[PDB]
Amino acid sequence: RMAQRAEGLATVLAIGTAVPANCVYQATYPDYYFRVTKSEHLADLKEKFQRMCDKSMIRKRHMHLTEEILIKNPKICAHMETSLDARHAIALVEVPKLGQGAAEKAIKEWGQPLSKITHLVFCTTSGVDMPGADYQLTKLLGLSPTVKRLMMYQQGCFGGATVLRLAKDIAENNRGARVLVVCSEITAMAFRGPCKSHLDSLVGHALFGDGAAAAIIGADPDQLDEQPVFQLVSASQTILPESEGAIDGHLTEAGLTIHLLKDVPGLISENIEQALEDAFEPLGIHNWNSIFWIAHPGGPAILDRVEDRVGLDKKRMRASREVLSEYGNMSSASVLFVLDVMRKSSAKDGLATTGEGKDWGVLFGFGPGLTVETLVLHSVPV
Amino acid sequence: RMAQRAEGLATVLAIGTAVPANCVYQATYPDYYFRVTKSEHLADLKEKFQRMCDKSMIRKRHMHLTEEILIKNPKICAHMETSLDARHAIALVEVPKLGQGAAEKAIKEWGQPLSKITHLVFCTTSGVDMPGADYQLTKLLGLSPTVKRLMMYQQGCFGGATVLRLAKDIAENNRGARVLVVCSEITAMAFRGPCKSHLDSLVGHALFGDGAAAAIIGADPDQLDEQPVFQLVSASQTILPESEGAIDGHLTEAGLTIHLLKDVPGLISENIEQALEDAFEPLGIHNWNSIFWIAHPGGPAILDRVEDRVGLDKKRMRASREVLSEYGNMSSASVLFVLDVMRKSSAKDGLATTGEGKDWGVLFGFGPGLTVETLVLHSVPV
Ligand SMILES: CC(C)(COP(=O)(O)OP(=O)(O)OC[C@H]1O[C@@H](n2cnc3c(N)ncnc32)[C@H](O)[C@@H]1OP(=O)(O)O)[C@@H](O)C(=O)NCCC(=O)NCCS
Ligand SMILES: CC(C)(COP(=O)(O)OP(=O)(O)OC[C@H]1O[C@@H](n2cnc3c(N)ncnc32)[C@H](O)[C@@H]1OP(=O)(O)O)[C@@H](O)C(=O)NCCC(=O)NCCS
């Protein structure tokens, strides 16, 4: 036991990202969406969708699904037709392939041989299968057949926080472990035409985009060959009081359906200070403008309400809002994109640490429960 | 970091099991199965299914699905009709409820307050949903809202080994952590009528049953208040060479379909010696009759081929064969039932350890990949 284990904290050693090449601009999206679903006669519904997209603070999203694919799969354009098998035909191939794109970029930054990856954690909310995306990615990358795998399916938007919590315990308990974490999302599972009876589906179609992110996590980094980016200090999870049914998602004959209450930004903002105190009181930290912020960009209302309740300067949410602007809500992958934006912009602006010059940081994932996952991070010098 | 972590090995502190009350005897099952699926005109197929049931070495299985439920859900009785929503309506309720039955039993054996459970790992192969079964069980048991959860969906028959590997790293890396692990399986997702085009489906219908198992895992057991049952020494995982496509499962519009090659018992038995050497050579153990055996009872051919290739005395597989006889193949739950049978029959026969009087043991999970998971165990004195 005593020398089977690592000594130091789990550390992010590399981050990489990938998105589908196909880019949909938000400014023209209501026209596109109502045209390809043959729903232009639903004029009041289209005006509601236009207001949602104008308020989204999204400039563009990357989507694997193209009009050519929608023309070949018309049942996906209906609101609620039997379509799971046609959706799985796309997502069970594209989720591992997008993850491979991200993982290759992480592994290139890390610079170590594939044989040094001991563990793989793969997270998605886009389809399920056996063997899973973890097995498919093992095959695509040429990982060791002895790689220890964790397949995290149907996770939702806190999944990016969950894979870091998992990688922390693996990296710290196993000397020499190097964990590859990959989050990969393809919205072909959930895309459907609009309907007056499901206005919360319309909100999902204004926000959700595709993407994959990957990191290499290890404890006891090699002084010469590896370069720390962030340390993972602590990980917590809670179910919010009075939140039953706020965010539900069902995998059905008609694909993935989303059930989203208007109460979500309120429920999160009412409970976020208690999550901060629980994570930071043991470290003697109380000033929420003195830490860097990695907030899951679930939508602009969640970030606005948290900023207002906690009293943040507009700088604190900048990295989260840049990801929302350039990619939308990529479910489990989003927080790894925010970490990557933050460390790259910190170096580019000549700041002293990977966390915008701050030492301590917080990462928040939000999803069904309503669940809030809270990680404490430490930056490293630039 | 050095304050945050436990000292000793992750230990099983309690094990509990539960099955649906409804019991189907194997002797009469071909008549039942062909009658409730209205398939009596398929004479040749029924004779083939009779031979599979006679060779199964299964005396009975527990099944939530009853004839009354099958009468109300006729599309579940067809071979391949649209039926996922009807199957999910059963399994998304019954999986957490059967898990609750097992978890209550484990918690009673342990005797500590519910507030001492810090982590929950829930594994199933029977349906997916958001929030998941882990959330539903937290609600059913009244676990703390701060319980850190891992939801392991669409795992398959190595999932029982996987939750123990996860619990080992959590329990060892987190001082005071107590992990509730729960595996719960309901075959309503996969049950379907017979077809001459899918003989591997027929094999699934001869073998798979319903069941849930739970354990409490912790490191540094309290001298006065806790009593270890097994120690978790090491956990490995490998993909077998030349095994592509041996075991596939798809979640489709028609529910969960299984694709099973006749090659499976050969592939496992040809690679098991190497898995034993990898796990035990570092402990200086070479004699496979000197260790206790927890083998996933995937079917009688796997146990027979492993026993013959490795040269085991018939005593070694007794606990695995007893679980196969009394419950059939309960996917991810099966190995925890075997651990429970082994420790109970060891005490009843007055043996010196919970592992049939042996010090060291091996647990094997088998599933899609083809994946073999290998855990080294240590017994405790009786
Ligand atoms: C969608 C969003 C960008 C709109 O911005 P906003 O400042 O609230 O703008 P408004 O309040 O004017 O809302 C625009 C329209 O969206 C509708 N809307 C917003 N949230 C909705 C929901 N959950 N269900 C149904 N309609 C919703 C409003 O009713 C309004 O319809 P109307 O103009 O016909 O009355 C914003 O509400 C948001 O970020 N919410 C998402 C939070 C969330 O749940 N994200 C997590 C995803 S898991
Ligand atoms: C099915 C089983 C219980 C009985 O088979 P057995 O002891 O080999 O006896 P037999 O060879 O007479 O098998 C009976 C029939 O099963 C058929 N069968 C066995 N495995 C099969 C498979 N994977 N696909 C199709 N048919 C299969 C045989 O072809 C035979 O058909 P027949 O009687 O018309 O010739 C045994 O093969 C077994 O335990 N197999 C392991 C199944 C497995 O992979 N388990 C893990 C599932 S994850």
Author numbering:
A (entry chain A), B (entry chain B): 10 to 391
Kindly provide excerpts from the paper associated with this entry.
CHS is the first committed enzyme in flavonoid synthesis and belongs to the superfamily of type three polyketide synthases. Then, chalcone synthase (CHS) condenses one coumaroyl-CoA and three malonyl-CoA to form naringenin chalcone, which is subsequently converted to the (2S)-naringenin by chalcone isomerase (CHI). We determined the crystal structure of HvCHS in complex with CoA, CoA and naringenin, and CoA and eriodictyol.
The initial crystallization experiments with purified HvCHS yielded high-quality crystals that diffracted to 1.7 Å. In the refined structure, we observed an additional electron density in the substrate-binding cleft separating the N- and C-terminal domains, which we interpreted as CoA. All three HvCHS structures are highly congruent, even in residues lining the active site. The only difference can be seen in the β-sheet and loop from L269 to D272. Based on the electron density map, this loop appears to adopt two distinct conformations in all three crystal structures. However, while in the CoA-bound and the CoA/eriodictoyl-bound structures, the “in”-conformation has much higher occupancy and was therefore chosen for the final model, the “out”-conformation is dominant in the naringenin-bound structure. When mapping the active site residues known from the well-studied MsCHS enzyme, and our HvCHS structures, it becomes apparent that the residues in the substrate-binding channel and especially the cinnamoyl-binding pocket are highly conserved. The only differences are residue 199 in HvCHS, where the conserved threonine is replaced by an alanine, and residue 267 in HvCHS, where the conserved phenylalanine is replaced by an isoleucine.
